[PDB]
Design an enzyme around this catalytic site. Structure first.
Site, short mmCIF file in Angstrom:
data_model
loop_
_atom_site.label_atom_id
_atom_site.label_comp_id
_atom_site.label_asym_id
_atom_site.label_seq_id
_atom_site.Cartn_x
_atom_site.Cartn_y
_atom_site.Cartn_z
N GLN A 11 0.83 -1.20 0.00
CA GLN A 11 0.00 0.00 0.00
C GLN A 11 0.87 1.25 0.00
O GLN A 11 0.61 2.21 -0.75
CB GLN A 11 -0.94 -0.05 1.21
CG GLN A 11 -2.02 1.01 1.32
CD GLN A 11 -1.53 2.27 2.00
OE1 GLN A 11 -0.63 2.22 2.83
NE2 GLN A 11 -2.14 3.40 1.67
N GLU A 65 -3.78 -7.15 -1.99
CA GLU A 65 -5.12 -6.90 -1.47
C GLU A 65 -5.78 -5.83 -2.32
O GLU A 65 -5.08 -4.98 -2.88
CB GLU A 65 -5.02 -6.50 0.02
CG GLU A 65 -4.22 -5.24 0.35
CD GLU A 65 -5.07 -3.99 0.38
OE1 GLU A 65 -6.30 -4.11 0.56
OE2 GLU A 65 -4.52 -2.88 0.22
N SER A 134 7.53 -0.58 2.13
CA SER A 134 7.55 -0.24 3.54
C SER A 134 8.25 -1.32 4.36
O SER A 134 8.38 -2.47 3.93
CB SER A 134 6.13 -0.03 4.07
OG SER A 134 5.41 -1.25 4.06
N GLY A 138 2.83 -6.47 6.20
CA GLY A 138 3.33 -7.71 5.64
C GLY A 138 3.34 -7.71 4.12
O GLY A 138 4.22 -8.32 3.51
N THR A 139 2.37 -7.03 3.51
CA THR A 139 2.39 -6.86 2.06
C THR A 139 3.63 -6.10 1.62
O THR A 139 4.27 -6.45 0.61
CB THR A 139 1.12 -6.13 1.61
OG1 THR A 139 -0.03 -6.90 1.97
CG2 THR A 139 1.12 -5.90 0.11
N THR A 173 3.14 3.46 13.40
CA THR A 173 1.75 3.21 13.05
C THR A 173 1.34 1.75 13.19
O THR A 173 0.24 1.39 12.74
CB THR A 173 1.46 3.68 11.62
OG1 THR A 173 0.09 3.42 11.29
CG2 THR A 173 2.35 2.95 10.63
N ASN A 200 8.69 8.77 8.28
CA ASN A 200 7.45 9.55 8.31
C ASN A 200 7.44 10.61 9.40
O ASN A 200 6.88 11.69 9.19
CB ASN A 200 6.24 8.63 8.49
CG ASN A 200 5.90 7.89 7.22
OD1 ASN A 200 5.79 8.48 6.15
ND2 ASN A 200 5.72 6.57 7.33
N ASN A 222 4.45 11.55 0.50
CA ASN A 222 4.92 11.05 -0.78
C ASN A 222 4.88 12.06 -1.92
O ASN A 222 5.48 11.78 -2.96
CB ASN A 222 4.26 9.73 -1.23
CG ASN A 222 2.77 9.64 -0.99
OD1 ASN A 222 2.11 10.56 -0.54
ND2 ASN A 222 2.22 8.54 -1.48
N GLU A 248 26.73 5.07 -10.49
CA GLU A 248 27.55 5.94 -9.64
C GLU A 248 26.97 6.13 -8.25
O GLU A 248 27.75 6.39 -7.32
CB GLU A 248 27.76 7.31 -10.30
CG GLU A 248 28.62 7.31 -11.55
CD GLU A 248 27.90 6.94 -12.80
OE1 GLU A 248 26.69 6.72 -12.73
OE2 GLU A 248 28.54 6.87 -13.87
N1 LIG Z 1 1.93 9.84 0.54
C1 LIG Z 1 1.21 8.93 1.24
N2 LIG Z 1 1.78 7.80 1.86
C2 LIG Z 1 1.00 6.88 2.53
C3 LIG Z 1 -0.38 7.09 2.57
N3 LIG Z 1 -0.96 6.10 3.27
C4 LIG Z 1 0.00 5.25 3.69
N4 LIG Z 1 1.21 5.71 3.26
C5 LIG Z 1 2.44 4.96 3.58
O1 LIG Z 1 2.07 3.59 3.74
C6 LIG Z 1 2.63 3.02 4.91
C7 LIG Z 1 1.80 1.86 5.47
O2 LIG Z 1 1.53 0.91 4.46
P1 LIG Z 1 2.07 -0.62 4.54
O3 LIG Z 1 2.84 -0.85 5.82
O4 LIG Z 1 2.96 -0.82 3.34
O5 LIG Z 1 0.79 -1.59 4.45
P2 LIG Z 1 0.83 -3.01 3.68
O6 LIG Z 1 2.24 -3.51 3.45
O7 LIG Z 1 0.10 -2.92 2.36
O8 LIG Z 1 0.07 -4.08 4.62
P3 LIG Z 1 -1.47 -3.90 5.05
O9 LIG Z 1 -1.53 -2.87 6.15
O10 LIG Z 1 -2.01 -5.21 5.56
O11 LIG Z 1 -2.29 -3.44 3.87
C8 LIG Z 1 2.78 4.19 5.87
O12 LIG Z 1 3.90 3.99 6.69
C9 LIG Z 1 2.98 5.38 4.94
O13 LIG Z 1 4.35 5.70 4.85
C10 LIG Z 1 -0.95 8.20 1.95
O14 LIG Z 1 -2.17 8.36 1.99
N5 LIG Z 1 -0.16 9.10 1.28
#
Ligand SMILES: Nc1nc2c(ncn2[C@@H]2O[C@H](COP(=O)(O)OP(=O)(O)OP(=O)(O)O)[C@@H](O)[C@H]2O)c(=O)[nH]1
Ligand SMILES: Nc1nc2c(ncn2[C@@H]2O[C@H](COP(=O)(O)OP(=O)(O)O)[C@@H](O)[C@H]2O)c(=O)[nH]1
Ligand SMILES: Nc1nc2c(ncn2[C@@H]2O[C@H](COP(=O)(O)OP(=O)(O)O)[C@@H](O)[C@H]2O)c(=O)[nH]1
Lengths: 434, 267, 428, 95, 428
Positions: A11, A65, A134, A138-139, A173, A200, A222, A248
């Site tokens: 995500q 997902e 990230s 887990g994804t 988070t 973050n 982002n 480089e």
């Molecule tokens: N710019 C921006 N970054 C985001 C936003 N929402 C989430 N993020 C980033 O997404 C991170 C969390 O997503 P993940 O940990 O990758 O979630 P996941 O790996 O898909 O696993 P699940 O939670 O089960 O779906 C946060 O730490 C943020 O840095 C957003 O709305 N805008």
């Protein structure tokens, strides 16, 4: 001809990709339908041509997902991305490296490698891979772990840059972020070539000190990461004095094959109401990067020693104010290097100023992305290692992992390898005595 | 560091700044007064290639010899390639805009295109010359050896010859059509009917003013084609190239981009 | 009628080759379209030093355009003198050097040297007496540091008796645009020291010092800086393109300039230089050229001549003048700065005069000097190399490309071997 | 949230002026070394000057006065022959 | 005079015929209708060699177009220069070879062989003195192979003194358009050896090599490939078609390039081949044409000489050139590269200089060289053919089609044999 594949895991990864591909679309002509407006070849780094001029991206957006990638093909960019490039799952890993790596990886890893191969076929000189994921869910952790274990075997000679969402040391988070981070660092330490690091909480500070926005949306983080990646992947797009290819970066920032973790820093973070009142000169645009408060990661470098820094300037910049700023920084004492890399600067220069998305950042004619490999990151690592020790002392949340095929002893391997990484940090650290 | 000021302010390196500004300003005004700068050359070349002309009156619906008749390629429903380009294009002169640059007009190779204009604009108005023995008043006939000329006061002629590994169409690789100044058999074209069944009986008949005809170069038996898939990026907008290769379809019939209509004055 | 083949590699060596070709084309009367449009006939008397004649009056430079990254090719064709080179002499490469000497030495550079060798061959047999080769490249960095030394070694093995002039861009002490310069330039210097016959160490900081404290500019870009190297590298080989009294070729410079075969490290200078403010107020005379030449400011390497005795000094002059002032003015500087000259070589100054000055100038002069002050460059990069090699730093990028460990030790040993016999001349 | 924060941007055409002008600055080709006055015809061989073109014709053939304020017989030393066309002889016509 | 009755069999055959007849027409001026809308009177002088005068300044190519499927012929007829060939001269049958050299040398070709021999005889007899027939076919594939070989066979008997040349297009190593090609080719050489006098060996793969490498074309179309083979086809007949000094027809290029009677597989190659964008940067000096027609690229066969040695080399220069240079170059190469040429024959080279140049080019040259390298080809074919018959592969057809397995054995015999001739002479 000089192309790279952008992989967007999780995500986190898909929305990093959303922001940066919006920035690339505005950077080039690229309307959201897929065609440049009526009426050089700089697009042929991120955008494949097609008859009737449909410039399509070379990226892959993988998520285990629905919803987050389901809305991408529904929103305002529904025609740009290729329908088989965006890969969706049916069941999230639910913040679990065990589910991301050992159980929910295999019905989608074949499709992801098939898409990767078909993208790689349409590349004359493929420069490598830029992945964005990230250390949280887990994804974002387990699937990119399996992705490294596949692609480093398949494409072992290719360049690899990570842009890792490191977990915040204070706010955070999630509750299993130490687990996921401690596993993904172990399984991706030997396969990564260079991994730029972003946090973050640091950009939470950045939007309240330098944006002068007490309530910004979470899209802005982002958006700034999009600015970072558009600064680093720009010399292979346009022409400049010092043209820096992705190789480089690794050559001048990764000296040893375990230490590959630089921290980024941007400049002109100005928010368009304090922009036409300052010089925005090269000396201060470097001093703002080297001030220990504008980092992408909440870890000051005063409690650390720099290893190697790579500055990428873009815009109306002449190389010799850059030379003067480098001389001034090398004369500054509070900024101090290791004694074994005296010539510790790599300069890349591009002439195109950053195109500004309608939003918060300002129209500036000079920018620099500063990628510093430093030994300060040992503190940030050891903080999550302390949390991991306090969490693993009495086996909390371990049953969710071990019920998904995750062997128990690999937790001890991950902790041992991170302890060895702390060790490698310190003897990279101290000065010459022989 | 410092403040790094700009023009006008008397600090830092202002003295050599105003010296360099005066030198560059002197060079620019010298080139402007002598009229040797790039935009001045562009304006002269553009007025010379864009000067308006007039089309000959068709007292009867037949094209005669020596009259000012424009070549247009009609609009097409053909969809053999997705990358298309407009409709009702026109055979126009395109001298190449770097290899010309200096002097006044290029030499034996010039280059032809088909722009999207329909007005007679000067670079598209062709005189239907005599080639063989005739006068300024005879009507052009199906399958007769006519000739196309366009003007410095020097008559350039439409010309082509066979394909060698020295020259071709630019973006494609087929035959080249180019504007010469010489006079030979290579300058000579001819007109024929679009329908191959009812063609050979129409051989020996007058040509209507605005009608679909085929132009065959009578040394290679190749037809004039606007290669609509691709584009030539030149100054006068963006348009297509033109070449010579007879394209046939499922009835030994010519495709619509073999066809070329002629245009007279019909107010 | 004798030929110099101008070969250039790297994104630095390429653009210095480019900037060299406009000043040569302006000296020889060649516009970007390739035809001769000038005023004299001495420019066509010996046009066959750099320009192969073709059909239709088109003169094509005998230049070899080499780089591993295919990005500076579009720039050198994008320059105003772009329609002058062969599109075969642009030799491409679809990869990146990656700022690595091993990447250009033991990998894809070494599979591109075959095509570059074919190109330099096919031009080399189009000559009657090839005098030599002229490589312009950057010691610090990629492409030209490694694969330029491949070309140096290969053409030195294949033609063993042709004069090799290499204009090499050494790294600067104050600023470094590359971390791995102490690796790349030392490994390039080892290949230079048993190969080429005339090096020219050209420093960006020294050129920047000329741009401020001699040229007195405000925004010295690479082109404005870059042209000074182009001017000295045009002025060295002038008696072969234009006539004069007491001519001098590259072997004329060499046999006078290198006392020993290993002592072939110079540092150049081209100083009819003045600011735009002082430009109308220069009173150009041979003493005024010589005094502003021998000053330790116009010297194009980051080395101080006051810290070391000159071995030999050459002044390739150009212009309509009386050379009596040339002779006794360099005699005066020789007798005045006697402690900065070695005592075991009498009359250590080579004099040469070309009739034809550079275009737009009344007269000019090029300084070529073999000094012992090159240690402030070479020894400096040796402490840099040792202090970085001790921690085995930045190494796996070098040893994983098919390269053994101990030739780093060979490189350091044979750079400290350069250190010795020129330390010896400080105290004789 | 998506449509509210990621609206399309019609009419937001990017500019190309600044990169082009920075390129213009980073490459004044003769105006950096060029001396007191431009003169493309500034070339005469030493044989052509002190041989078969005789000498400088506007110069003083016998009026060699003694300039005192530069204590030397100036009007011959301060001549520096720059007259006439260059040493074209027929090579241009032959080529 | 000396007329040449042209024979083309097969798709490739009729398509190489399209271009040859188009090229010879452009040269002799004859338009797509016949009338000599040309200039220089030398053009109509020796038109007999390839044309026959019909009624009223109408020249009808002397060609017997042959095919076993009524299709390739139609493209030729309904193509541009397609109404220049007499209607009757076109021969074809409503059946097909089906890439079966068998269904060409014994089954389908038989019923049609009578028809062609009738047309062949008429043209051959109606002439002052036929210099020799000339066939263009593709050893790979049927018709051209089977029916084709059957022609050369039945034709050679009737006329046993006329230069029966052949521009066979042997199969390629890497590229493999067909699958049975192995058998087809191997099964035709036995016929070619005891039939043709000069058998030129062009290969589609080599034409590509050139197009890509030399011409620098990006979308090499089969048209451009048929052009390189027509360019050569005309060069070997330039002297007998355009008055010039040192004249040399076909039997001369066979009496100074065919050492022993069974060694007659020459590898062809034209010379002034340069990219459209490099045509401006070059000099058509004899040196250039030589340096090209002798490199291991301008060759039209896939058997590089370097590997082996040259039993002979023939060059026919089409241009007004300086005998001295033409001669000089020949001696030079022979002397310089002196291990790629055999030693048992002095002056292993025939030089000829036809004046009238190919339109557009100031000079030019075709190359016909008998090289022991040709061994490489028959081997690769044999390698494959034997790596198949071993398991009666794709054989059912070739067998029951009215044949036998013994013939296959002897085809590999005469093949493996010739391999020896071009091996012993490869070494004193
Ligand atoms: N710019 C921006 N970054 C985001 C936003 N929402 C989430 N993020 C980033 O997404 C991170 C969390 O997503 P993940 O940990 O990758 O979630 P996941 O790996 O898909 O696993 P699940 O939670 O089960 O779906 C946060 O730490 C943020 O840095 C957003 O709305 N805008
Ligand atoms: N004189 C001159 N110096 C240059 C030029 N271009 C680059 N340099 C110097 O060359 C250095 C870097 O070159 P480098 O990155 O090693 O090029 P590479 O060999 O392709 O890797 C910079 O520090 C510049 O100061 C030029 O065009 N002229
Ligand atoms: N030079 C040239 N070769 C061709 C052309 N067309 C086909 N070929 C070659 O001819 C071979 C196949 O021809 P083939 O099937 O045997 O034709 P067939 O004899 O009628 O059966 C292929 O390998 C092609 O490479 C052409 O137009 N020019």
């Amino acid at each position: 001809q000089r192309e790279c594949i952008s992989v967007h895991v999780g995500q986190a990864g898909v929305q990093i990709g959303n922001a940066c591909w919006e920035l690339y679309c505005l950077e080039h002509g690229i309307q959201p339908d897929g065609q440049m407006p009526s009426d050089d070849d700089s697009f042929n780094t991120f955008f494949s041509e097609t008859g009737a001029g449909k410039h399509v991206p070379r990226a892959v957006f993988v998520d285990l997902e629905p919803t987050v990638i389901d809305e991408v093909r529904t929103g305002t960019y529904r025609q740009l991305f290729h329908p088989e490039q965006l890969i969706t799952g049916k069941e999230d890993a639910a913040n679990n490296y065990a589910r991301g790596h050992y159980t929910i990886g295999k019905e989608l890893i074949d499709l992801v490698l098939d898409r990767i191969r078909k993208l790689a076929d349409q590349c004359t000189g493929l420069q490598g891979f830029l992945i964005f994921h990230s250390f949280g869910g887990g994804t974002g952790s387990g699937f990119t772990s399996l992705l490294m274990e596949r692609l480093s075997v398949d494409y072992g000679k290719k360049s690899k840059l990570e842009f890792s969402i490191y977990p915040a040391p204070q706010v955070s988070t999630a509750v299993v972020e130490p687990y996921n981070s401690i596993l993904t660092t172990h399984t991706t330490l030997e396969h990564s070539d260079c991994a730029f690091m972003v946090d973050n909480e640091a950009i939470y500070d950045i939007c309240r000190r330098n944006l002068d926005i007490e309530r910004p949306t979470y899209t802005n983080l982002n958006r700034l990461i999009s600015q970072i990646v558009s600064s680093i992947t720009a010399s292979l797009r346009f022409d400049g004095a010092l043209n820096v290819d992705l190789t480089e970066f690794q050559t001048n920032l990764v000296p040893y094959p375990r230490i590959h973790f630089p921290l980024a820093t941007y400049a002109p973070v100005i928010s368009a109401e304090k922009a036409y009142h300052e010089q925005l000169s090269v000396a201060e645009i470097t001093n703002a990067c080297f001030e220990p408060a504008n980092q992408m990661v909440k870890c000051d470098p005063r409690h650390g020693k720099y290893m190697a820094c790579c500055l990428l300037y873009r815009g109306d910049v002449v190389p010799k104010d850059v030379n003067a700023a480098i001389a001034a920084i090398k004369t500054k004492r509070s900024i101090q290097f290791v004694d074994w890399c005296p010539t510790g600067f790599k300069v890349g220069i591009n002439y195109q100023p950053p195109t500004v998305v309608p939003g918060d950042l300002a129209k500036v004619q000079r920018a620099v992305c500063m990628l510093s490999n430093t030994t300060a990151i040992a503190e940030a690592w050891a903080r999550l290692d302390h949390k991991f020790d306090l969490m693993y002392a009495k086996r909390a949340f371990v049953h969710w992992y071990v019920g998904e095929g995750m062997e128990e002893g690999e937790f001890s391997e991950a902790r041992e390898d991170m302890a060895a990484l702390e060790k490698d940090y310190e003897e990279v650290g101290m000065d010459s005595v022989e | 560091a410092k403040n790094l000021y700009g023009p006008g302010v008397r600090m830092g390196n202002w003295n050599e700044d105003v010296y360099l500004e005066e030198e560059r300003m002197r060079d620019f005004l010298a080139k402007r007064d002598e009229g040797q700068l790039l935009i001045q050359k562009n304006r002269r070349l553009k007025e010379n290639l864009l000067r308006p002309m007039q089309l000959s009156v068709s007292e009867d619906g037949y094209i005669h010899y020596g009259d000012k008749v424009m070549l247009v390629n009609p609009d097409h429903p053909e969809v053999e390639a997705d990358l298309f380009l407009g409709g009702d294009l026109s055979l126009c002169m395109t001298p190449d805009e770097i290899k010309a640059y200096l002097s006044d007009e290029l030499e034996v190779p010039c280059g032809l295109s088909a722009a999207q204009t329909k007005i007679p604009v000067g670079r598209n108005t062709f005189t239907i010359l005599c080639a063989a023995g005739e006068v300024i008043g005879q009507v052009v006939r199906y399958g007769q050896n006519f000739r196309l000329g366009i003007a410095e006061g020097r008559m350039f002629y439409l010309s082509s010859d066979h394909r060698t590994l020295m020259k071709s169409s630019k973006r494609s690789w087929l035959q080249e059509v180019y504007l010469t100044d010489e006079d030979s058999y290579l300058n000579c074209w001819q007109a024929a009917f679009p329908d191959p069944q009812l063609r050979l009986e129409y051989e020996g008949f007058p040509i209507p003013a605005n009608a679909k005809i085929l132009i065959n170069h009578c040394h290679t038996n190749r037809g004039l084609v606007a290669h609509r898939h691709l584009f030539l990026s030149t100054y006068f907008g963006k348009e297509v190239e033109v070449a010579a290769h007879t394209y046939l379809d499922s009835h030994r019939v010519e495709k619509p981009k073999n066809h070329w209509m002629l245009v007279t004055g019909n107010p | 009628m004798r030929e110099i083949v101008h070969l250039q590699a790297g994104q630095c060596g390429n653009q210095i080759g480019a900037k060299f070709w406009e000043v040569i084309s302006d000296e020889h009367g060649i516009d970007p379209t390739g035809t001769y449009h000038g005023d004299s006939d001495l420019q066509l008397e010996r046009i066959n030093v750099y320009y192969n004649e073709a059909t239709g009056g088109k003169y094509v430079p005998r230049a070899v355009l080499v780089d591993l990254e295919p990005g500076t090719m579009d720039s050198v064709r994008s320059g105003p003198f772009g329609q002058i080179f062969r599109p075969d002499n642009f030799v491409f490469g679809q990869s990146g050097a990656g700022n690595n000497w091993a990447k250009g030495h033991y990998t894809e550079g070494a599979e591109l040297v075959d095509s570059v060798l074919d190109v330099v061959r096919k031009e080399a047999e189009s000559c009657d007496c090839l005098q030599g080769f002229q490589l312009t490249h950057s010691l610090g960095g990629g492409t030209g540091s490694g694969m330029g030394t491949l070309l140096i070694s290969k053409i030195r093995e294949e033609y063993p008796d042709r004069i090799m002039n290499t204009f090499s861009v050494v790294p600067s002490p104050k600023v470094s645009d590359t971390v791995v310069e102490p690796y790349n330039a030392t490994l390039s210097v080892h290949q230079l020291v048993e190969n080429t016959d005339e090096t020219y160490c050209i420093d960006n900081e020294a050129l920047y010092d000329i741009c401020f404290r001699t040229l007195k500019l405000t925004t010295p870009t690479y082109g404005d800086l870059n042209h000074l190297v182009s001017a000295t590298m045009s002025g060295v080989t002038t008696c072969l393109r234009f006539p004069g009294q007491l001519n001098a070729d590259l072997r004329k410079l060499a046999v006078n300039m290198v006392p020993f075969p290993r002592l072939h490290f110079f540092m150049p200078g081209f100083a009819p230089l003045t600011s735009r403010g002082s430009q109308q107020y220069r009173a150009l005379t041979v003493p005024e050229l010589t005094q502003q030449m021998f000053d330790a400011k116009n010297m194009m390497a980051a080395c101080d001549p006051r810290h070391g005795r000159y071995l030999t000094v050459a002044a390739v002059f150009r212009g309509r003048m009386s050379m009596k002032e040339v002779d006794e003015q360099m005699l005066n500087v020789q007798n005045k700065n006697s402690s900065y000259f070695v005592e075991w070589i009498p009359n250590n100054v080579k004099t040469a005069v070309c009739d034809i000055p550079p275009r737009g100038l009344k007269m000019s002069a090029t300084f070529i000097g073999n000094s012992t002050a090159i240690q402030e460059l070479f020894k400096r990069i040796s402490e840099q190399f040792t202090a970085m090699f001790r921690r085995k730093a930045f190494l796996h990028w070098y040893t994983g490309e098919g390269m053994d460990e101990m030739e780093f030790t060979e490189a350091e040993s044979n750079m400290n071997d350069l250190g010795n016999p020129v330390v010896t001349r400080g105290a004789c | 949230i998506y449509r509210k924060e990621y609206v399309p941007f019609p009419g937001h055409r990017p500019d190309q002026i600044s990169r082009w002008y920075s390129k213009r600055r980073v490459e004044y080709k003769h105006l950096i070394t060029h001396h007191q006055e431009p003169s493309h015809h500034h070339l005469i061989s030493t044989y052509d000057d002190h041989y078969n073109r005789h000498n400088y014709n506007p110069g003083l053939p016998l009026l060699r006065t003694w300039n005192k304020h530069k204590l030397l017989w100036l009007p011959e030393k301060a001549d520096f022959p720059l007259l006439a066309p260059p040493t074209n002889y027929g090579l241009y016509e032959r080529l």
